[PDB]
mmCIF file of C-alpha atoms in Angstrom:
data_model
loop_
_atom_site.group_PDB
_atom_site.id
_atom_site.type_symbol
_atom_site.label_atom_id
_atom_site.label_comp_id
_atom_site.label_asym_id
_atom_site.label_seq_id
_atom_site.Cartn_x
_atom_site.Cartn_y
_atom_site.Cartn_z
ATOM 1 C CA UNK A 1 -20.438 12.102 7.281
ATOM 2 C CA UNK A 2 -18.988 8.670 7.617
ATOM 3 C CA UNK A 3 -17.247 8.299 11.328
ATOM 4 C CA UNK A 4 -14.943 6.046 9.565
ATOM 5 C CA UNK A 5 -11.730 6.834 7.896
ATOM 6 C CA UNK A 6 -12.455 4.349 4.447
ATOM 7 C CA UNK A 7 -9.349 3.625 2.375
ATOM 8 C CA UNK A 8 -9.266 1.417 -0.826
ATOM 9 C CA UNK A 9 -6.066 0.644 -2.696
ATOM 10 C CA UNK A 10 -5.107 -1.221 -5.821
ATOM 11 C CA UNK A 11 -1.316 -1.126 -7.847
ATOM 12 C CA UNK A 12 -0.525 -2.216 -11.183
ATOM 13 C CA UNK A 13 2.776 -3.271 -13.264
ATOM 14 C CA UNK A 14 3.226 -4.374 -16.760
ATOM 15 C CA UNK A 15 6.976 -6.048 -16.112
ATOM 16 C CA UNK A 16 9.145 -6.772 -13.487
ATOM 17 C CA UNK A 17 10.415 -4.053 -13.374
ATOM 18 C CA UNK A 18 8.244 -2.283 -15.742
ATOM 19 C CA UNK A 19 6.252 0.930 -15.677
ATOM 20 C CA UNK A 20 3.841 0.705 -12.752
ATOM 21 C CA UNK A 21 1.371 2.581 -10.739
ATOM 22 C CA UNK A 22 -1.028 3.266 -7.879
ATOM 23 C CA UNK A 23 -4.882 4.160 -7.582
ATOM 24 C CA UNK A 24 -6.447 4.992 -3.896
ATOM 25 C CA UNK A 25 -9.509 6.439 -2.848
ATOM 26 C CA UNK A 26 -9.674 7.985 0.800
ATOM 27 C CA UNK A 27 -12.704 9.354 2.164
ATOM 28 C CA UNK A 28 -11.806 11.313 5.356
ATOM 29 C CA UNK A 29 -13.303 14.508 6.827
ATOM 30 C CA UNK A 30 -16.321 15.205 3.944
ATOM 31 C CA UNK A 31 -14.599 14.870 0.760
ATOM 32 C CA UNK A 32 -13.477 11.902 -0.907
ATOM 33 C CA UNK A 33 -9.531 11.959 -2.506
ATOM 34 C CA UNK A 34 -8.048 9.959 -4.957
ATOM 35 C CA UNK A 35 -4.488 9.712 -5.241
ATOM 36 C CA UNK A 36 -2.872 8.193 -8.337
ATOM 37 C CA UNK A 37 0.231 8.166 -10.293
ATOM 38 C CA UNK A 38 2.802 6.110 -12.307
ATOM 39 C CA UNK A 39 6.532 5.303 -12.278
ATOM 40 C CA UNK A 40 9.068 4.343 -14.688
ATOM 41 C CA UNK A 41 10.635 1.239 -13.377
ATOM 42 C CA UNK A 42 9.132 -0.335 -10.591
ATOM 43 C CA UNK A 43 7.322 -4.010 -9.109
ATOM 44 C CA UNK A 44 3.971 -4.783 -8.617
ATOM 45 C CA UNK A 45 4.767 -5.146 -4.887
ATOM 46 C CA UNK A 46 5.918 -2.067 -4.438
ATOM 47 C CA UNK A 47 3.286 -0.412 -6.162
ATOM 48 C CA UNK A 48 0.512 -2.016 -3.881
ATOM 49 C CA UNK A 49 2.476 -0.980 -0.959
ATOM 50 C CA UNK A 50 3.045 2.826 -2.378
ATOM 51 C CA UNK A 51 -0.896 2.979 -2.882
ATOM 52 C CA UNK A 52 -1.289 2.114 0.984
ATOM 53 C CA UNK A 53 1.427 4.611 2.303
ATOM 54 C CA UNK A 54 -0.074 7.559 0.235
ATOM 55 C CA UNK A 55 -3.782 7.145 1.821
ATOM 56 C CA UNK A 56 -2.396 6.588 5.294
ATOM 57 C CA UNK A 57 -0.122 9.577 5.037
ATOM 58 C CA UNK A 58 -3.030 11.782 4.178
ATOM 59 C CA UNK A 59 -4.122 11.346 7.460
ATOM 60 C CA UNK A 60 -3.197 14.336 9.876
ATOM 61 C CA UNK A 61 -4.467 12.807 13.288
ATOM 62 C CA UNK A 62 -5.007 9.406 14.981
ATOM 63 C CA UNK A 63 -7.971 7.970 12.805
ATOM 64 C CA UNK A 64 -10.244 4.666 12.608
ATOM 65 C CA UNK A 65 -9.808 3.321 9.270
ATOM 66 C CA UNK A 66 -10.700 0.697 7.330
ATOM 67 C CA UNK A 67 -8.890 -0.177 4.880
ATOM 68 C CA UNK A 68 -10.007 -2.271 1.557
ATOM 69 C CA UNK A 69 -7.306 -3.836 -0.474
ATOM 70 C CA UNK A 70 -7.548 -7.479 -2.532
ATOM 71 C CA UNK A 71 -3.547 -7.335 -2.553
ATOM 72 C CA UNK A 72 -1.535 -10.604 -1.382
ATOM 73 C CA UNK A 73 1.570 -9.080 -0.390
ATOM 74 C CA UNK A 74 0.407 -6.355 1.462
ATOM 75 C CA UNK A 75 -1.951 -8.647 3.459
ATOM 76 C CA UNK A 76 1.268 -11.390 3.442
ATOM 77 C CA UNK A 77 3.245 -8.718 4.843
ATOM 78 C CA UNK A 78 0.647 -7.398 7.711
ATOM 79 C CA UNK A 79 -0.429 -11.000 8.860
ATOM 80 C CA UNK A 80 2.647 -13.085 8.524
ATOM 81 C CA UNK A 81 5.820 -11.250 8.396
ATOM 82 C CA UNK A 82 5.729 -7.873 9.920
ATOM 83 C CA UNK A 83 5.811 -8.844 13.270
ATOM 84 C CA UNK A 84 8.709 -10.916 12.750
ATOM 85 C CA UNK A 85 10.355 -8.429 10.539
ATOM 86 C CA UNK A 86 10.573 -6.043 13.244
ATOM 87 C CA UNK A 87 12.083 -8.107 16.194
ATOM 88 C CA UNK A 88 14.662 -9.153 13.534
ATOM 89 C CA UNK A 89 15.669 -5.577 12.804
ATOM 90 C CA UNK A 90 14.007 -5.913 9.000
ATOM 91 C CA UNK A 91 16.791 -8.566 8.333
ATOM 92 C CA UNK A 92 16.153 -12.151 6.458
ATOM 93 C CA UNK A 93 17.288 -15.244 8.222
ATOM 94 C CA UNK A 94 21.061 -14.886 6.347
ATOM 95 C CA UNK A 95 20.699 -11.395 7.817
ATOM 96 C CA UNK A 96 20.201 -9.175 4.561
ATOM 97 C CA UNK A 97 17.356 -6.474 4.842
ATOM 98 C CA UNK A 98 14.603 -7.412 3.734
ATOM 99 C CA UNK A 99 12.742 -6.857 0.430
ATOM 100 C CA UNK A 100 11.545 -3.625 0.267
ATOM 101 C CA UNK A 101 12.124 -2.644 3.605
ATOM 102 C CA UNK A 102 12.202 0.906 1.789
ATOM 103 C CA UNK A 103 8.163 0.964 1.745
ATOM 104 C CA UNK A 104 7.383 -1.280 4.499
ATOM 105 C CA UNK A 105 9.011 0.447 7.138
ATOM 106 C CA UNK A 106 7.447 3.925 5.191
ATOM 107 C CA UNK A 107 4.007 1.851 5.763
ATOM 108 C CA UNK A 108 4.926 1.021 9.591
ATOM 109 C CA UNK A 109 5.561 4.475 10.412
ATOM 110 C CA UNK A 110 2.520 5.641 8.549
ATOM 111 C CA UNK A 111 -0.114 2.911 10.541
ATOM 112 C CA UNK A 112 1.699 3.793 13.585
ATOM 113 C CA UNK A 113 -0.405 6.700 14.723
ATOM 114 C CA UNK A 114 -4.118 4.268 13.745
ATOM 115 C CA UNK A 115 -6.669 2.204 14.715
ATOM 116 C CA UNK A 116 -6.767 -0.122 11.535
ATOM 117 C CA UNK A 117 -9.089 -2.905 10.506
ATOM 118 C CA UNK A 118 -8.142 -4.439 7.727
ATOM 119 C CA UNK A 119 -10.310 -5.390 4.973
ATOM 120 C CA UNK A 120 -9.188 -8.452 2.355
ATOM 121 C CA UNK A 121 -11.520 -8.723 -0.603
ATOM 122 C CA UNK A 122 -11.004 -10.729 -3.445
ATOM 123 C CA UNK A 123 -9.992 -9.623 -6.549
ATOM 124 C CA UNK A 124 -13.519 -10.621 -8.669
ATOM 125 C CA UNK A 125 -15.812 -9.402 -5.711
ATOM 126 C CA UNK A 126 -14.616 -6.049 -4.335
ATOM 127 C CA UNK A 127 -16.978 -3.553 -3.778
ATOM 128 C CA UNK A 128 -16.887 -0.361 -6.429
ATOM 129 C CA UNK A 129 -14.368 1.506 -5.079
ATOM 130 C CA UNK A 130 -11.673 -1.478 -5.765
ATOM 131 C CA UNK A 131 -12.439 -1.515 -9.389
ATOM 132 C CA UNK A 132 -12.127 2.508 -9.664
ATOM 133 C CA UNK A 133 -8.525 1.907 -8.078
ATOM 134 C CA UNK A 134 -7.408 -1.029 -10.518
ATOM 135 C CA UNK A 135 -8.759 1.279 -13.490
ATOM 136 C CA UNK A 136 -6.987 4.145 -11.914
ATOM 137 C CA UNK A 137 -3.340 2.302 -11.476
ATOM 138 C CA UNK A 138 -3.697 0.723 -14.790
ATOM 139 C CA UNK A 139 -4.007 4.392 -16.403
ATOM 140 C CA UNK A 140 -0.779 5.987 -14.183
ATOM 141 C CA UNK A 141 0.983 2.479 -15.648
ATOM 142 C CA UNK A 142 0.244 3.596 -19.163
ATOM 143 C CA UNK A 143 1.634 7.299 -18.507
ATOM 144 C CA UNK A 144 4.408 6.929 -15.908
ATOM 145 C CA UNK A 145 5.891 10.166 -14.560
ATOM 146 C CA UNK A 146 7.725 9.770 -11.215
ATOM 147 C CA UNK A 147 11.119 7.734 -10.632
ATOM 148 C CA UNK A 148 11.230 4.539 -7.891
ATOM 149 C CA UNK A 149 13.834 5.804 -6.012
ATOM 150 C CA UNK A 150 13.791 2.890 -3.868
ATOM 151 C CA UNK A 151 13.754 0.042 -6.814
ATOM 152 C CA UNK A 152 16.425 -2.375 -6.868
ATOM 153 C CA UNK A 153 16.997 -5.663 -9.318
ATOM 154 C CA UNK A 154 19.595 -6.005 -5.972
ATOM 155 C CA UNK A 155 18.554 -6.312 -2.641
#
């Protein structure tokens, strides 16, 4: 048994908006899950972002996880603007909330309780896992069968 939580996520969209979805694998306690599905109307964004909550809120206790994701925006989010977002109130500089602040404050609440190291791979060389995550999100993308509550062409 690993003494690691490992996480790998991966989202997919064909349009902006267009139907979209999620893959993740988590391997926690002795069983490995993979979590998957596909919405309606949604971004690429959030669909990266969704893939990340869903792992993290798996997790019943205070974990050490690594997490394994080849996603720009999450990483974006987590190394440049997160920090900032939050001593701002998750308000833009001509004080509008900020994009998505749906799923990034669902994230920060969901990290919260972890020990996280972060894991950036690039898109042609991530390990196995990555690719069974891509595969997985573009197959909930092709069959979409939740609503994106928080969507909007708006804020």
């Amino acid at each position: 048994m690993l003494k690691q939580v490992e996480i790998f996520t991966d989202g997919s969209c064909l349009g902006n908006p267009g139907p979209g979805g999620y893959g993740a694998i988590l391997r926690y306690r002795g069983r490995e899950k993979t979590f998957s599905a596909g919405y309606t109307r949604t971004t690429n964004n959030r669909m990266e972002l969704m893939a990340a909550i869903v792992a993290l809120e798996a997790l019943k206790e205070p974990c050490e996880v690594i997490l394994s994701t080849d996603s720009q925006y999450v990483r974006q989010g987590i190394t440049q603007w997160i920090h900032n977002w939050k001593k701002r109130g998750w308000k833009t500089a001509d004080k509008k909330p900020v994009k998505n602040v749906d799923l990034w404050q669902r994230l920060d609440a969901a990290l919260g309780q972890h020990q996280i190291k972060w894991e950036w791979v690039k898109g042609h060389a991530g390990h196995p896992e990555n690719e069974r995550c891509d595969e997985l999100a573009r197959a909930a993308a092709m069959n979409p069968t939740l609503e994106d509550t928080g969507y909007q062409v708006e804020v």
